[PDB]
Amino acid sequence: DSRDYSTELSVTVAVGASLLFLNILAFAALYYK
Amino acid sequence: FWINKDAVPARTSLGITTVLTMTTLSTIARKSLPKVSYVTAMDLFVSVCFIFVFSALVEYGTLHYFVSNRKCLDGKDCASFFCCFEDCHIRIAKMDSYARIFFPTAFCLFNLVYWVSYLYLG
Amino acid sequence: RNSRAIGVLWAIFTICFAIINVVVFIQPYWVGDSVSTPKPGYFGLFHYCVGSGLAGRELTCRGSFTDFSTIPSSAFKAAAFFVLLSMVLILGCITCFSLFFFCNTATVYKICAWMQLLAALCLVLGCMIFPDGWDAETIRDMCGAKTGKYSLGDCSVRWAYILAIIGILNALILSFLAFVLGNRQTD
Amino acid sequence: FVNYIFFGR
Amino acid sequence: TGAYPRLSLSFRLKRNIGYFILQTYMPSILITILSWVSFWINYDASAARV
Ligand SMILES: *[C@@H]1O[C@H](CO)[C@@H](O[C@@H]2O[C@H](CO)[C@@H](O[C@@H]3O[C@H](CO[C@H]4O[C@H](CO[C@H]5O[C@H](CO)[C@@H](O)[C@H](O)[C@@H]5O)[C@@H](O)[C@H](O[C@H]5O[C@H](CO)[C@@H](O)[C@H](O)[C@@H]5O)[C@@H]4O)[C@@H](O)[C@H](O[C@H]4O[C@H](CO)[C@@H](O)[C@H](O)[C@@H]4O)[C@@H]3O)[C@H](O)[C@H]2NC(C)=O)[C@H](O)[C@H]1NC(C)=O
Numbered sequence: 095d096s097r098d099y100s101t102e103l104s105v106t107v108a109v110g111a112s113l114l115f116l117n118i119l120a121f122a123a124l125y126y127k
Numbered sequence: 128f129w130i131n132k133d134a135v136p137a138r139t140s141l142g143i144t145t146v147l148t149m150t151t152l153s154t155i156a157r158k159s160l161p162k163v164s165y166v167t168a169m170d171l172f173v174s175v176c177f178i179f180v181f182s183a184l185v186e187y188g189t190l191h192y193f194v195s196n197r198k199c200l201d202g203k204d205c206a207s208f209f210c211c212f213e214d215c216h217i218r219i220a221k222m223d224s225y226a227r228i229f230f231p232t233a234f235c236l237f238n239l240v241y242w243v244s245y246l247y248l249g
Numbered sequence: 250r251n252s253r254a255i256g257v258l259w260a261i262f263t264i265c266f267a268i269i270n271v272v273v274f275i276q277p278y279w280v281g282d283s284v285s286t287p288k289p290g291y292f293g294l295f296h297y298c299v300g301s302g303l304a305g306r307e308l309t310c311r312g313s314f315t316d317f318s319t320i321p322s323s324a325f326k327a328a329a330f331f332v333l334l335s336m337v338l339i340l341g342c343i344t345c346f347s348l349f350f351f352c353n354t355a356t357v358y359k360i361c362a363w364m365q366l367l368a369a370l371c372l373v374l375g376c377m378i379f380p381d382g383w384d385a386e387t388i389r390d391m392c393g394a395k396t397g398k399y400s401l402g403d404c405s406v407r408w409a410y411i412l413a414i415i416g417i418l419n420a421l422i423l424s425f426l427a428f429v430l431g432n433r434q435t436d
Numbered sequence: 437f438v439n440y441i442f443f444g445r
Numbered sequence: 446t447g448a449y450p451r452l453s454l455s456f457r458l459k460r461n462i463g464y465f466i467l468q469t470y471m472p473s474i475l476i477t478i479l480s481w482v483s484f485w486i487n488y489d490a491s492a493a494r495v
Pocket residue numbers: 453455456457
């Protein structure tokens with residue numbers, strides 16, 4: 095493995111951004127429909 | 128919580144006896160170790176259980192006291208959107224009604240988190 | 250349609266948020282060391298694993314929140330304490346999901362709007378206090394003297410810290426969502 | 437249980 | 446009989462007050478606050494307070 099952490103950061107950022115986009119989509123569907 | 132509000136000696140006996148039982152359980156659980164000066168998993172579990180029973184006891188005490196001895200912003204208004212105050216007595220008499228599901232589900236959540244924390248990552 | 254589905258979605262995602270919050274709390278992998286490392290190993294809020302590097306890079310893992318004496322610095326103590334407060338608060342809402350069936354819906358939506366905001370504030374404060382801890386002898390030894398107060402030095406950020414940052418942002422968005430759900434659904 | 441249903445609610 | 450040599454190796458031991466905090470002091474304290482609950486209970490409930 096050595097010191098390769100870039101993949102972990104990439105996948106974590108990807109899933110975090112996906113969840114954040116889902117929450118923002120729900121909020122957008124709520125506050126102005 | 129399922130006993131009537133007017134059964135004061137019974138509910139008081141239940142609470143006080145449960146806290147004594149927690150203290151006794153804590154002592155007999157911790158006497159199976161050396162006299163180490165840090166907490167363990169069993170001590171933490173016993174502490175949380177003691178907190179739960181003490182919360183139930185003080186809940187009944189509060190109920191008895193309040194029942195017996197006493198009577199810019201896109202949003203149009205800033206306080207309602209980002210605060211709250213409409214009287215929040217209102218439903219203090221209802222405390223035993225919804226306290227029958229608050230405590231068990233709180234305990235279930237604590238047990239889930241505790242066991243998942245130790246049995247896998249430790 | 251709107252309420253009966255959006256509430257279930259918010260509840261499910263709040264459960265997911267609490268799950269990731271506890272996961273980032275108990276996960277040791279927070280601050281690792283890159284190839285330019287005096288010594289190998291990773292670092293956590295209260296669990297540091299320093300690779301000895303003798304023959305098979307065996308790690309002398311040591312530390313636990315159950316004893317503050319093992320924690321290197323008081324900044325880590327404060328960070329773990331406030332993460333614990335945030336996790337207590339979010340678990341307070343997942344406890345309160347049963348309370349909907351008895352009390353008024355909008356006010357309890359506002360209750361977790363506020364207490365989600367406090368959970369977010371606690372997580373924020375812990376996350377900004379966490380950099381303060383990179384000054385103890387352990388961090389200065391394994392990650393090099395270049396590490397300092399609010400100075401990464403030769404250390405590298407692992408998935409847990411960025412996970413906590415997106416958890417902060419997610420907590421803020423969830424609090425706002427609870428606020429608007431409580432306020433608008435009354436009308 | 438009996439105290440709940442026959443003396444309380 | 447006479448004068449004799451002596452060496453002395455002395456240690457100072459400080460007791461770690463963590464076990465008694467979580468076995469003696471804190472249970473007794475919490476028992477005291479719980480005993481204070483009798484004041485809040487109504488006066489006529491003699492059985493419960495006693
Ligand atoms: C735990 O509890 C224990 C028990 O209570 C406690 O022990 C006491 O600790 C103190 C030290 O902190 C001890 O006191 C010291 O004793 C030293 C020895 O002094 C005697 O011997 C002298 C002879 O000199 C030769 O001694 C040996 C060989 O025998 C060797 O080092 C050399 O060859 C050396 O030349 C002797 O001179 C001295 O005489 C006493 O009487 C004369 C008068 O007749 C008087 O003038 C002296 O002052 C003295 O009272 C004695 O018989 C001693 O050197 C040492 O001196 C300190 O003070 C001088 C300045 O005055 C400094 O220059 C020196 O560096 C020291 O700081 C000191 O007196 C004491 O004896 C222990 N208790 C007992 C009962 O033995 C522990 O400390 C406690 N705590 C912990 C955690 O350990």
